[PDB]
Target: Beta-lactamase
Amino acid sequence: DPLRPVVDASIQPLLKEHRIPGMAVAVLKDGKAHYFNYGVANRESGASVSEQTLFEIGSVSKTLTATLGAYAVVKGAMQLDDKASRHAPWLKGSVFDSITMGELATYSAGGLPLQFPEEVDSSEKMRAYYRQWAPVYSPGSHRQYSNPSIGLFGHLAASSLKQPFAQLMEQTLLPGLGMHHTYVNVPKQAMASYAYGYSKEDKPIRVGMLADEAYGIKTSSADLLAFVKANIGGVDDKALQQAISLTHKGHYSVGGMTQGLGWESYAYPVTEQTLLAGNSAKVILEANPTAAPRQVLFNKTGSSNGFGAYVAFVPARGIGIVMLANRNYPIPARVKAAHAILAQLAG
Ligand SMILES: *C(=O)[C@@H](NC(=O)/C(=N\OC(C)(C)C(=O)O)c1csc(N)n1)[C@H](C)NS(=O)(=O)O
Ligand SMILES: [Zn+2]
Ligand SMILES: [Zn+2]
Ligand SMILES: [Zn+2]
Ligand SMILES: [Zn+2]
Ligand SMILES: [Zn+2]
Ligand SMILES: [Zn+2]
Ligand SMILES: [Zn+2]
Model:
């Protein structure tokens, strides 16, 4: 593979510097998938990573949850300007009478936090959490990246479709996308392909309320590259195609980043500096005011304990990259390596 030297030059230094036990890398160019696999999925078994190895992709899950939401819209079960409580009777009477589904999807409802408080560990406590929640900002005015925000959006999207979220994903959406080894619940027969994550102390670890919706997907580099392909070349089902397209529309911007449903987008070519800034601690951790929206590059980061994932692609150039590791290594390292590889593929 004549792309191997290019990918190795950017990936190998990451593996050494951060002692990454294993990484699956997949690249798309000119309609062809290329797989580059490094190290081990499981340090006990010493089993090699392949493009069929399942990794936790953490917040990259939000691109798939967004696509379910968009599918619900395409099917007429909901609209992004619906008030949230329209799809949750238990939210009637709360501030969610005046927050929209799109605002939940784009983390712009008014300062829902990054994580549920640790005490919110059941269905009953979660419902009380949202019912008592007091907005910090007016709806639409600030982005605060939030699991409770998009988690709720996904949860209500499934409810709009009258099916549990895990079932819709595993039985309809993901196989519709060509993703047959992508799970919220990894089945018995897939367990032997399931990587372990490795904490900073080299302890093996595996994955909360609305975990499924916000960060719970297990998938392979092959499946994730198929999702990238679907975001470039498209898919057979008309409803799913339109769903995917809705996830590309920009809602608002924060600096040079434009927020859509799940995917975050940039004018391409994109400087390393612009891509680093939109994926910076400032953008991830603080509230930022929303501004008017923007070739286009789409990306999403994901970081669970013991896992670090990144996906980026450019439909106008037919290029894309997936990087899945079982170490949570820094986002800037992911962004830099991806940017370098895509620049070489773009020619
Ligand atoms: C998405 O991956 C999201 N990550 C999380 O919600 C989790 N942890 O976040 C950090 C490490 C900040 C924390 O400890 O609070 C998480 C999910 S399952 C699990 N065990 N941890 C992050 C914030 N998104 S990303 O874009 O920064 O990667
Ligand atoms: Zn490190
Ligand atoms: Zn209840
Ligand atoms: Zn529910
Ligand atoms: Zn520690
Ligand atoms: Zn057809
Ligand atoms: Zn919007
Ligand atoms: Zn402000």
